[PDB]
Paper text:
In this context, Trametes multicolor [name] (TmP2O; EC 1.1.3.10; for a review, see) is of interest since it can oxidize both β-D-Glc and β-D-Gal to the corresponding 2-keto sugars, which are intermediates for production of D-fructose and D-tagatose. TmP2O is a homotetrameric enzyme produced by lignocellulolytic fungi and has been assigned a role in lignin degradation. The reaction catalyzed by TmP2O is of the ping-pong type involving a reductive and an oxidative half-reaction.
Based on the overall more similar kinetics with Glc and Gal, we expected the [name] mutant to behave structurally more similar to H167A (and the wild type) than does the H450G variant. Thus, the binding of Gal is identical to that of Glc binding for productive oxidation at C2. Not only is the axial O4 group spatially accommodated in the GAL mutants, but also receiving stabilizing hydrogen bonds from Asp452 and Thr169. In the case of the GAL mutants, subtle backbone changes in the active site provide conformational freedom of the active site to accommodate the axial O4 hydroxyl group without interfering with the function of Thr169. Stabilizing interactions are offered by Asp452 Oδ2 and Thr169 Oγ1 to the axial C4 hydroxyl group in Gal, which is expected to facilitate binding of Gal oriented for productive 2-oxidation, presumably also to promote conversion to the 2-keto galactose product. For the [name] variant, a selectivity ratio of 210 shows that the relative efficiency is even less favorable than for the wild type.
Residue numbers in the entry:
A (entry chain A), B (entry chain B): 43 to 618
C (entry chain C): 92 to 181
D (entry chain C): 454 to 543
Write the structure that this text describes.
């Protein structure tokens, strides 16, 4: 390990990888530290779903997701177990057990909130949905000039999209995809527009999709290498970053204290620029552990010296979920253009169509696929081919339906994976609502209890706000009920429901961006720089100050591209 | 990819890795193919449990195991879902859905049987318990000479033990381990001997254990490299091996037909020597699809051309399981030697013991750990330290208790992990029975139905035989209930029970060894050579022909070592 | 119409369930594969426990039940007694 | 008549039940018939059903009824966990 860097990045997630790509590219000497390790194969921080085996057994990936989702704050446990043998050691109290947080009020939690500690962060398992925010969900980067703000955002998002390889055609030939898309388009004709969920992904084959990841943004290989001889990068995995160190005048970061988890060694790392991209929870944790904001249970009669808005105004989306079983009607429509004579299983059976007939309801590629499934698998009662890709349908957030929609198949299922209904019938529904930023919704850190890595235990104090949030959330549940009925009835076991607060993992605002610290109640300016500090920057969904329903990672990434612009304007790469 | 190699190995499990370490070591130009991919990090085929994060959160590791166990044979589902919406598409029959096997009788299955397709195979998630078999459990390698046979086994097991880094002292300094060990020793004094489970593992720190894997056996790196400049090895992952091609005379294999899962291309690979180490199911699958045994539902009217015992005489172990909550008596006994000075949390509070005191019931290392824990955590009502390593206790298989026993903490829990009861109180009990090999017990493959890799679908026809196996299983359950009661009462939610058949993954005998194909009803000789064929070898628990209780991996390894001794003598490495 | 039940209205479900005898229960095909290998174990899904083997479980009224007590189903019903409008009426 | 284990965490004063009931077209093919070989608990010909809600109006109304319930109930309160909207066993 070296001593002096131009730039140090904490976290090797997609946002840390954005800083790495911009800055390593522009010639900065860069170190990146991650508390987690490389486990996802030779491509470092790559999507764990990009194995042939997972994509042939997609029901199984849920387990990978669960295995690397460590809950953020688990209230103390009060379940009554009163059928222990009387010789068994039994508690008198519900005492602090199994890593639980005794600070946590179980009724004001985001109990589904969880973090992932591996190289590549959550991008080694995410769904890859990368929508842009429209204006209503999105912070301003230029005020009083909408066209300049829009134009800035378009430029940022267009770059972010090329980093993620975001596209909207990777499922264009799915029968199930088009079944639902065409149906929804017809039903809502001229009230809402549907399209492919934009996905960070490239299709390799009819049966395999390369899902994007941190790795796609930046390959995390150490440089100089053969392919980058003039670049300087080093990744230090299994290194826990603990504190940034402030100068006396609170105007500069002097160093970063780390703990090497293998050797157990501690160092102070010196850099020109300090970049924090450890996730919306752990960025806050690190900053709070370095004298920013207020350690311990909020106490207003002890106002913070620095960043009084840190861990306030946090946002998490409401999530409603169901699955549906496709209607008899939609299923019969799959084969509307077919002429089926005789009986299945007999030498007399035939299934045929007229190629390029004006009145065919489906294109030739569809009917060809149906014909071949039906002829080659005459035992099967359904017209959908066995390896037909899943739906990937959305109507994006609009003011008259202010929620994000996914009508799709997610690898992260929420129950036992049911086996009695054919998966070809199944569609998932996930509507995400936006949450008003409210001061009283807080992420804070205990001054007594600590986590698995001996940092202050995160604690939530969260409720979905009264008024618009709660009303939109219920109007979103009902919308899901109304829309999904158009495709088929609910699947027993996946009835329409609100999911645990936090489960959707779109936490925002915990170190929020604004124009002005006091007047916008924020922690970083529009360059994502920390107020007061020449050389400390924060990257992530924690920066996002607005109420949004769409998946936030593309937006976080865009903000990180703008952050890099400022850094290249204000610090010089060391000579190589 | 080269076209011609000296030896080709199918599968990168510990057993394939045994053949590679011996043969690459001996100068042979070796290619290894695995259907699965490198997905464990920079140490190829290494144990997924060997990350700081998993050892800080061992509960979460159940999810990694689940995520790579893919059920072998799933019977057609006949659960009634009669609450669908009337608009939903609804079945008229229980048709073949979701990759279910319609050949499989659900009352004669190994429903818990699963396979793992990753580089390293199952050793990337296994428990690492590696005991030797006593004579009772073990195939003969020399007849009419017991002492010579014992000497041959002990020579093979000692080598096998170094390759895996097996040892019996990595948990020597765990309180819980010794709490359990000492009490069971005393309870069964003169009657049974208790010890640490032999574990393929090397302790690195008081809180970190490097579990062994295929990687420990052979690092799977391509050679020549710097550390081995004169050896020749190529690993090709994502390659489905489909067929060995037999010559017309059935005397020799002429090629291995592979399918590259990434490009889609198919190849014929040529080697002097071919080794199948794809697991007890998959080896059998590749054999059958190559013309050995009998494809399709067993048909005694058509006796097979080659290897009639293949897929017959299959063994899997009964497994009974519970968890216990440690007795009050035992938990009190953990602090027996301590002198306590008043009220915890208070000023008066002091905990001390007398090192070396002969009146002590426990060792100094024990008392220093309790003392330290009870002084730094006065809020805690238990005398066990928070990161005390888990128990790892066994009384090995014997005539008067013919079953292997494990009294420990397994990363594979079978239900939702519970959090009402402190994890320091819980001990798992797993007893494994031995199963007599019967002809009627079978693993066969459909001549119509294929798997996710478009290869013949495996199907079981199994029952635990009446007679000694059944009586010993029931006896085995009484014994777990009786023995476990001496430590604590059953944990609710893990009551004493028989686990689904096949869940314990100790399947043997599917391509079994013996001296003589007919008399011993077997598929390979004691060099693991397939009868009739000069250059075809099989590796794995598939070879073991006996009724055994202990974990088979180490035994299969030993057979593989013997097998490579034959190979080294009878084939010559190509010139470099 | 007991003081005890209208003071414990949740406990009445139990009285209902106590007198609803299912009309046609199809043969059970649930797989139980964790029996002790000594316990007597079925080779087939045979006719067990009053099940109706004539009954196709995918074309059932599985919830249909009957009550055999004087006063029949009126000893437990909810007492909703709307009139049918013409559209619903013979 | 409650259908699951009754929950105890939410105050009952807050709880409201929603039951909507659809009409079914009478169709010849929907039968209640009786075995000539199997018998019930009182030695009478065992009842056997052959039923499915008719496609068409009956089916369409039933889905729409589900949606109506979802839409209506939202006006009063969100769904109680454990009692999510569902079609009951026929
Ligand atoms: C788990 C999950 C997440 C997403 C989706 C699916 C599921 C099941 N779906 C998805 C998401 N969002 C997208 O917009 N859309 C999709 O459809 N998911 C969210 C997305 O996954 C995250 O927003 C994104 O990765 C965040 O990027 P990041 O801000 O770079 O944060 P990460 O958590 O990914 O990476 C942080 C990183 O830092 C580490 N760490 C944490 N603490 C420390 C300390 N103290 N020192 C050093 N390193 C630290 C981690 O280990 C980690 O890699
Ligand atoms: C998953 C499991 C495994 C065991 C225990 C715990 C759990 C949860 N713990 C345990 C084990 N056994 C022991 O002796 N003691 C324990 O403490 N478990 C089982 C053990 O893990 C296995 O017995 C052992 O690995 C067997 O090794 P192997 O014979 O080399 O077989 P593997 O299945 O590990 O590796 C085979 C390998 O081949 C591949 N493959 C399969 N088919 C093909 C084809 N057609 N072409 C190419 N490659 C193929 C795989 O992908 C794989 O890696
Ligand atoms: C159980 C139940 C049923 C009703 C509701 C709720 C509950 C859980 N709620 C409800 C009812 N219907 C209303 O319109 N509104 C409500 O709000 N329920 C249904 C109502 O309960 C029935 O519709 C009504 O009783 C039917 O009346 P019935 O034609 O008089 O028939 P019953 O089934 O009540 O009583 C018949 C009776 O005959 C006997 N029996 C049966 N077989 C024989 C033979 N072979 N020999 C002699 N006697 C026989 C019985 O034992 C019984 O007492
Ligand atoms: O809860 C599952 C969801 O979680 C998120 O974080 C993703 O953005 C969604 F696309 C979806 O997979
Ligand atoms: O089912 C869990 C078991 O899996 C077997 O294969 C192992 O050998 C046992 F040690 C235990 O982990």
């Amino acid at each position: 390990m070296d001593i002096k860097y131009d730039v140090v990045i904490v976290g090797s997630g997609p946002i840390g990888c954005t800083y790495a790509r911009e800055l390593v590219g522009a010639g900065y000497k860069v170190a990146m530290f991650d508390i987690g390790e490389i486990d996802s194969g030779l491509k470092i921080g790559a999507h764990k779903k990009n194995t042939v085996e997972y994509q042939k057994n997609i029901d199984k990936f849920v387990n990978v997701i669960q295995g690397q989702l460590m809950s953020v704050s688990v209230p103390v446990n009060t379940l009554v177990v009163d059928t222990l043998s009387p010789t068994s050691w039994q508690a008198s109290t519900f005492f602090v057990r199994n890593g639980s947080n005794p600070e946590q009020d179980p009724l004001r939690n985001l109990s589904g909130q969880a973090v992932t500690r591996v190289v590549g962060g959550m991008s080694t398992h995410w769904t890859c949905a990368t929508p842009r925010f429209d204006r209503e969900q999105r912070p301003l980067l230029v005020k009083d000039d909408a066209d300049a703000d829009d134009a800035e955002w378009d430029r940022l998002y267009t770059k972010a999209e090329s980093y993620f390889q975001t596209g909207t055609d990777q499922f264009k030939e799915s029968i199930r995809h088009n079944l639902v898309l065409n149906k929804l388009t017809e039903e809502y004709k001229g009230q809402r527009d549907f399209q492919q969920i934009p996905l960070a992904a490239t299709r390799r084959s009819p049966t395999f999709v390369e899902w994007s990841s941190a790795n796609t943004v930046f390959d995390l290989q150490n440089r100089p290498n053969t392919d980058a001889p003039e670049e300087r990068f080093n990744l230090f995995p299994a290194v826990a970053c603990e504190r940034v160190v402030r100068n006396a005048l609170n105007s500069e970061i002097e160093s970063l204290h780390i703990h090497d988890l293998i050797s157990g060694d501690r160092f102070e790392i010196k850099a020109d620029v300090y970049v924090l991209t450890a996730g919306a929870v752990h960025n806050t944790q690190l900053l709070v552990n370095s004298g920013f904001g207020q350690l311990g249970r909020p106490n207003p009669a002890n106002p913070p010296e620095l960043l009084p808005s840190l861990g306030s105004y946090i946002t998490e989306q409401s999530l409603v979920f169901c699955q549906t079983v496709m209607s008899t009607e939609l299923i019969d429509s799959v084969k509307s253009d077919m002429t089926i004579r005789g009986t299945p299983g007999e030498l007399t059976y035939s299934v045929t169509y007229t190629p390029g007939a004006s009145t065919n309801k489906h294109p030739d590629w569809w009917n060809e696929k149906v014909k071949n499934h039906m002829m080659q698998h005459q035992e099967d009662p359904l017209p959908i081919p066995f390896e037909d890709p899943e739906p990937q349908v959305t109507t994006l957030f609009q003011p008259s339906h202010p929620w994000h929609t996914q009508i799709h198949r997610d690898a992260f299922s929420y129950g036992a994976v049911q086996q009695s209904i054919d998966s070809r019938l199944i569609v998932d529904w996930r509507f995400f609502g936006r949450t008003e930023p409210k001061e009283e919704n807080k992420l804070w850190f205990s001054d007594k209890i600590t986590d698995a890595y001996n940092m202050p235990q995160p604690t939530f104090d969260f409720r979905f706000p009264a008024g618009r949030t709660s009303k939109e959330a219920e109007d979103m549940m009902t919308d899901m009920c109304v829309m999904s009925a158009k495709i088929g009835g609910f699947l027993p076991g996946s009835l329409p429901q609100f999911m645990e607060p936090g489960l959707c993992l779109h936490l925002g605002g915990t170190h929020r961006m604004g124009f002005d610290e006091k007047e916008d109640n924020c922690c970083v300016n529009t360059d994502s720089r920390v107020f007061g500090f020449k050389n400390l920057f924060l990257g992530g969904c924690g920066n996002i100050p607005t109420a949004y329903g769409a998946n936030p990672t593309l937006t976080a990434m865009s903000l990180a591209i703008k952050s890099c612009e400022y850094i290249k304007q204000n610090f010089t790469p060391s000579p190589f």
